[PDB]
Amino acid sequence: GDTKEQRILRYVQQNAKPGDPQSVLEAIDTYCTQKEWAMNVGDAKGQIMDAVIREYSPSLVLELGAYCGYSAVRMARLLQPGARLLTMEMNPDYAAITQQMLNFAGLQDKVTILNGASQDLIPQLKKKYDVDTLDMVFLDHWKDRYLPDTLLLEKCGLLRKGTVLLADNVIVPGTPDFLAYVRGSSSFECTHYSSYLEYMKVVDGLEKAIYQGP
Ligand SMILES: Nc1ncnc2c1ncn2CCCCCNC(=O)c1cc(-c2ccc(F)cc2)cc(O)c1O
Ligand SMILES: [Cl-]
Ligand SMILES: [Cl-]
Ligand SMILES: [Cl-]
Ligand SMILES: [Mg+2]
């Protein structure tokens, strides 16, 4: 039968207003609080995300790991006209959910899905997707990939002075190599935002790591 992700999308379609991103976020968070937990960033950490996005007003954001599109809706709804989000989702079923979520929210013109693995797509961003450098990166994919993909972004010339990395789940499930690396590197200026795991009374946090150049 249907999957949890399909159930979340249907719930949104039936309990939110087309073209109203805030209603979409609220519907997802209600479903995941009342019916079934799911690994969306959630409202606690989402509020911290919102504060960061508002501070930096990025023109080009890369997201690693879309899932159902919750974080993509969260960020894209606060981007300025003409600003863009690219989100990389390796699971094709999740990619289809995310596209449909974005379509429902009316944010499809601001967001592009890149279906594939981050390590394969990151090296294509300049030539295939006409990216120069990224203003912000939201990391929310497999936790073991945060570090290697950060290093790949740098190798590929995608980071500039001031690029904001914002990493979910640095406590649960945790990203110990990434966290050690950024906090020990003179190429990053790091801030920890303590919060809670989505929909749970469990401590989690976001790490912001601002790239300083080589
Ligand atoms: N061993 C592998 N090999 C390849 N892929 C793999 C994998 N293992 C996973 N994945 C595919 C990653 C795609 C989703 C990435 N996100 C997450 O995994 C994630 C998980 C939690 C979570 C927290 C507490 C819990 F008790 C359980 C899960 C919360 C979040 O906010 C998340 O973003
Ligand atoms: Cl999410
Ligand atoms: Cl992905
Ligand atoms: Cl929450
Ligand atoms: Mg997460």
Coordinates of C-alpha atoms and ligand atoms in Angstrom, one line a residue, residues 65 88-90 116 141, ligand 3:
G65 CA 18.6 15.9 0.9
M88 CA 19.6 17.2 -4.4
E89 CA 17.5 14.1 -3.6
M90 CA 18.9 10.7 -4.5
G116 CA 21.0 11.9 -8.0
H141 CA 21.3 14.0 3.8
Ligands
CL3 CL 20.1 13.3 -1.7

